[PDB]
Amino acid sequence: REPRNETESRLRRIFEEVLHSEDVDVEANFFELGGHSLQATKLVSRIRSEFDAELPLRDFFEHPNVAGLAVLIGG
Template sequence: MTTADVLAIFRTVLETEDIAASDDFFDLGGDSLLATRVLSALARAGGAELTMEDFLMAPTPELLAARAAGAAGAVVS
């Protein structure tokens, strides 16, 4: 999952193209309900199963992409 992928998801969910990689989702008007849509889209697109806590700790496209990349490569036992 790249930053560009996460940016595309943010833009779709927030219905705006005016988002940069370092923009905070919640500062852009996002809320917890919209965040669940982002998390669901990330799981469908890249297989990364992130939690709301992950999202709160990494609310920008660049930070969330890094978390998603780590989560997708993690081995779950």
């Protein structure tokens, strides 16, 4: 499935950069893509800076997908 936002698109690029991968599904679970701790750290710290929004790690754990994270950065 294709990204539908500047946000979804940019977030998916961050996922791809961190998971050392390409063509990362927008609704795929971060862990199910083989996502471990230090990856998740680099991921969360980058989203925090690039979008200038305080993202609590807990909320990331609940919604660890490009699709869901977009909504949260928005709302």
